[PDB]
Design an enzyme around this catalytic site. Sequence first.
Site, PDB file in Angstrom:
ATOM      1  N   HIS A  12       0.801  -1.241   0.000  1.00 18.34           N
ATOM      2  CA  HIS A  12       0.000   0.000   0.000  1.00 18.34           C
ATOM      3  C   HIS A  12       0.827   1.281   0.000  1.00 18.34           C
ATOM      4  O   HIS A  12       1.232   1.828   1.025  1.00 18.34           O
ATOM      5  CB  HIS A  12      -1.004   0.088   1.190  1.00 18.34           C
ATOM      6  CG  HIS A  12      -2.018   1.212   1.038  1.00 18.34           C
ATOM      7  ND1 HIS A  12      -3.326   1.036   1.100  1.00 18.34           N
ATOM      8  CD2 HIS A  12      -1.857   2.574   0.936  1.00 18.34           C
ATOM      9  CE1 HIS A  12      -3.990   2.203   1.040  1.00 18.34           C
ATOM     10  NE2 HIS A  12      -3.073   3.213   0.943  1.00 18.34           N
ATOM     11  N   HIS A  14       1.166   4.886  -2.689  1.00 16.26           N
ATOM     12  CA  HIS A  14       0.800   5.660  -3.896  1.00 16.26           C
ATOM     13  C   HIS A  14       1.993   6.239  -4.700  1.00 16.26           C
ATOM     14  O   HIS A  14       2.761   7.048  -4.213  1.00 16.26           O
ATOM     15  CB  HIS A  14      -0.090   6.860  -3.448  1.00 16.26           C
ATOM     16  CG  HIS A  14      -1.427   6.439  -2.782  1.00 16.26           C
ATOM     17  ND1 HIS A  14      -2.623   6.391  -3.401  1.00 16.26           N
ATOM     18  CD2 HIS A  14      -1.668   6.070  -1.460  1.00 16.26           C
ATOM     19  CE1 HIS A  14      -3.587   6.025  -2.523  1.00 16.26           C
ATOM     20  NE2 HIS A  14      -3.014   5.804  -1.292  1.00 16.26           N
ATOM     21  N   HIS A 211      -9.944   1.692  -0.209  1.00 11.09           N
ATOM     22  CA  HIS A 211      -9.591   2.379   1.017  1.00 11.09           C
ATOM     23  C   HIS A 211     -10.832   2.619   1.877  1.00 11.09           C
ATOM     24  O   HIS A 211     -11.801   3.184   1.406  1.00 11.09           O
ATOM     25  CB  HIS A 211      -9.073   3.769   0.728  1.00 11.09           C
ATOM     26  CG  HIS A 211      -7.719   3.925   0.061  1.00 11.09           C
ATOM     27  ND1 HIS A 211      -7.426   3.598  -1.164  1.00 11.09           N
ATOM     28  CD2 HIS A 211      -6.599   4.522   0.602  1.00 11.09           C
ATOM     29  CE1 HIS A 211      -6.173   3.963  -1.422  1.00 11.09           C
ATOM     30  NE2 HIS A 211      -5.634   4.546  -0.327  1.00 11.09           N
ATOM     31  N   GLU A 214     -10.269   4.603   7.079  1.00  7.65           N
ATOM     32  CA  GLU A 214      -9.176   5.460   7.527  1.00  7.65           C
ATOM     33  C   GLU A 214      -9.677   6.643   8.373  1.00  7.65           C
ATOM     34  O   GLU A 214      -9.253   6.900   9.495  1.00  7.65           O
ATOM     35  CB  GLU A 214      -8.319   5.993   6.344  1.00  7.65           C
ATOM     36  CG  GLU A 214      -7.119   6.943   6.622  1.00  7.65           C
ATOM     37  CD  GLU A 214      -6.553   7.474   5.313  1.00  7.65           C
ATOM     38  OE1 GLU A 214      -7.160   7.260   4.264  1.00  7.65           O
ATOM     39  OE2 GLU A 214      -5.486   8.090   5.322  1.00  7.65           O
ATOM     40  N   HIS A 235      -6.224   0.549   5.082  1.00  6.33           N
ATOM     41  CA  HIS A 235      -6.310   0.925   6.470  1.00  6.33           C
ATOM     42  C   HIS A 235      -7.287   0.053   7.327  1.00  6.33           C
ATOM     43  O   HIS A 235      -6.941  -0.836   8.104  1.00  6.33           O
ATOM     44  CB  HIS A 235      -6.732   2.410   6.607  1.00  6.33           C
ATOM     45  CG  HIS A 235      -5.827   3.358   5.847  1.00  6.33           C
ATOM     46  ND1 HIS A 235      -4.670   3.854   6.327  1.00  6.33           N
ATOM     47  CD2 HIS A 235      -6.014   3.920   4.581  1.00  6.33           C
ATOM     48  CE1 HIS A 235      -4.116   4.712   5.446  1.00  6.33           C
ATOM     49  NE2 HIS A 235      -4.944   4.730   4.368  1.00  6.33           N
ATOM     50  N   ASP A 292       2.414   4.264   2.388  1.00  8.94           N
ATOM     51  CA  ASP A 292       1.370   5.137   1.817  1.00  8.94           C
ATOM     52  C   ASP A 292       1.814   6.278   0.905  1.00  8.94           C
ATOM     53  O   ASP A 292       1.594   6.241  -0.304  1.00  8.94           O
ATOM     54  CB  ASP A 292       0.406   5.595   2.930  1.00  8.94           C
ATOM     55  CG  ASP A 292      -1.003   5.992   2.550  1.00  8.94           C
ATOM     56  OD1 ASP A 292      -1.411   5.716   1.450  1.00  8.94           O
ATOM     57  OD2 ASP A 292      -1.721   6.557   3.376  1.00  8.94           O
TER      58      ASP A 292
HETATM   59  N1  LIG Z   1      -3.248   9.228   0.937  1.00 10.33           N
HETATM   60  C1  LIG Z   1      -4.123   9.502   0.001  1.00 10.33           C
HETATM   61  O1  LIG Z   1      -5.303   9.664   0.280  1.00 10.33           O
HETATM   62  C2  LIG Z   1      -3.652   9.568  -1.409  1.00 10.33           C
HETATM   63  C3  LIG Z   1      -4.415   9.698  -2.493  1.00 10.33           C
HETATM   64  N2  LIG Z   1      -3.498   9.808  -3.628  1.00 10.33           N
HETATM   65  C4  LIG Z   1      -3.877  10.076  -5.004  1.00 10.33           C
HETATM   66  C5  LIG Z   1      -4.001   8.765  -5.845  1.00 10.33           C
HETATM   67  O2  LIG Z   1      -2.859   7.866  -5.523  1.00 10.33           O
HETATM   68  C6  LIG Z   1      -5.170  10.916  -5.026  1.00 10.33           C
HETATM   69  C7  LIG Z   1      -4.945  12.406  -4.642  1.00 10.33           C
HETATM   70  N3  LIG Z   1      -6.287  13.051  -4.571  1.00 10.33           N
HETATM   71  C8  LIG Z   1      -6.888  13.833  -5.524  1.00 10.33           C
HETATM   72  C9  LIG Z   1      -8.155  14.213  -5.082  1.00 10.33           C
HETATM   73  C10 LIG Z   1      -8.342  13.635  -3.782  1.00 10.33           C
HETATM   74  C11 LIG Z   1      -9.367  13.659  -2.886  1.00 10.33           C
HETATM   75  C12 LIG Z   1      -9.247  12.978  -1.677  1.00 10.33           C
HETATM   76  C13 LIG Z   1      -8.047  12.275  -1.380  1.00 10.33           C
HETATM   77  N4  LIG Z   1      -7.835  11.540  -0.270  1.00 10.33           N
HETATM   78  C14 LIG Z   1      -8.567  11.604   0.840  1.00 10.33           C
HETATM   79  O3  LIG Z   1      -9.623  12.183   0.986  1.00 10.33           O
HETATM   80  C15 LIG Z   1      -7.912  10.868   1.974  1.00 10.33           C
HETATM   81  C16 LIG Z   1      -7.662  11.780   3.170  1.00 10.33           C
HETATM   82  C17 LIG Z   1      -6.288  11.514   3.760  1.00 10.33           C
HETATM   83  C18 LIG Z   1      -6.315  11.618   5.268  1.00 10.33           C
HETATM   84  C19 LIG Z   1      -6.628  12.990   5.712  1.00 10.33           C
HETATM   85  C20 LIG Z   1      -7.872  13.275   6.276  1.00 10.33           C
HETATM   86  C21 LIG Z   1      -8.138  14.518   6.830  1.00 10.33           C
HETATM   87  C22 LIG Z   1      -7.135  15.469   6.800  1.00 10.33           C
HETATM   88  C23 LIG Z   1      -5.915  15.207   6.184  1.00 10.33           C
HETATM   89  C24 LIG Z   1      -5.664  13.975   5.613  1.00 10.33           C
HETATM   90  C25 LIG Z   1      -7.011  12.273  -2.303  1.00 10.33           C
HETATM   91  C26 LIG Z   1      -7.137  12.926  -3.486  1.00 10.33           C
HETATM   92  C27 LIG Z   1      -2.255   9.733  -3.164  1.00 10.33           C
HETATM   93  N5  LIG Z   1      -2.248   9.517  -1.843  1.00 10.33           N
HETATM   94 ZN   LIG Z   2      -3.563   5.093   0.442  1.00 10.91          ZN
END
Ligand SMILES: NC(=O)c1cn([C@@H](CO)CCn2ccc3ccc(NC(=O)CCCCc4ccccc4)cc32)cn1
Ligand SMILES: [Zn+2]
Length: 349
Positions: A12, A14, A211, A214, A235, A292
């Site tokens: 897992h 990206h 996913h 999480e 997760h 991740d």
């Molecule tokens: N860890 C990830 O979620 C993630 C997603 N990507 C790419 C694809 O590999 C997508 C990037 N991306 C583009 C639009 C978009 C919308 C939502 C998300 N991801 C999430 O909503 C997960 C939230 C991640 C956890 C979190 C929660 C609250 C505050 C801060 C962080 C990724 C997005 C890379 N890493």
């Molecule tokens: Zn992920």
Amino acid sequence: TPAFDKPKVELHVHLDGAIKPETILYYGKRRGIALPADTPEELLNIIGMDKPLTLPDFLAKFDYYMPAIAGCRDAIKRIAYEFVEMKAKDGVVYVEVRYSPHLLANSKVEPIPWNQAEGDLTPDEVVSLVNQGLQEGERDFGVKVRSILCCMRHQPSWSSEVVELCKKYREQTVVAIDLAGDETIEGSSLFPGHVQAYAEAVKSGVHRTVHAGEVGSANVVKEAVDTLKTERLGHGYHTLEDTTLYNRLRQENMHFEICPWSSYLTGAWKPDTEHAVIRFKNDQVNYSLNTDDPLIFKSTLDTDYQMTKKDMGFTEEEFKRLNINAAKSSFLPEDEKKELLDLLYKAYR
Ligand SMILES: NC(=O)c1cn([C@@H](CO)CCn2ccc3ccc(NC(=O)CCCCc4ccccc4)cc32)cn1
Ligand SMILES: [Zn+2]
């Protein structure tokens, strides 16, 4: 010191968050985009987190670097390659790497991502290029690599071409489909787009991960198991909120792709709590250790391992069994999967 110097499995991670700081400056410079700063150094520190932020502060990170890579064929291919050598340095023997092909495109995608201009890099040749560099990474660096193509929650309309990209690029190197991005949007596991894509996946033997849990409730995990039919969970921390669901998943031997360090940084775990992983360790669930997004979280696999052995008393025996579990639940064909197993036993004993 490294916590565990023994080969490892990662399921897992990206691609689009495991990009070297140095090579984003390289393509921003060579193409116009111009990042918010221009040493490698000073770039990692702003596109990286040390503390939890909000969701829009998290997405804005993507908004610096993505447009510097997306839409250049040159870049897509190098980042794939550089991903494989990054993993050789962690000691990985087999990795699955995931990404959305639409998010790196600039034509035959709607909307166009990152407000790029339109070019002619389409979703389907992006998967072809990542495949390339992933393959020549494999055969230069000793790391067996496959991939995972992500569906996006907010965009059920892309999903059906995800699943056909999965079928067209089968074991050469795509082995599964995923659903990423924001399990907060209401109902998003049940959108018709995502639903029929996972149905087509089932129909045509593509493997499935999601996913879920999480930052979403245990109902999102339940949607992922009963209706999307996942084989594994990204997760899945929030399954602990429902105990029958948890017990059932344990009985069913579900695999949890755990991201320890990711979890602290994002806010999915708050340090005043039980870490979900130690629970999983104590209950001998099937889980893996994963990082991740090493670009964003400032990190390396061994970060995850150090946090688990320092702050949560994991030991070498746990680390070996969790990598064995990882391998068993990998999405390799049964044959290449037994050889992976044999390898690890032989170097674990
Ligand atoms: N860890 C990830 O979620 C993630 C997603 N990507 C790419 C694809 O590999 C997508 C990037 N991306 C583009 C639009 C978009 C919308 C939502 C998300 N991801 C999430 O909503 C997960 C939230 C991640 C956890 C979190 C929660 C609250 C505050 C801060 C962080 C990724 C997005 C890379 N890493
Ligand atoms: Zn992920």
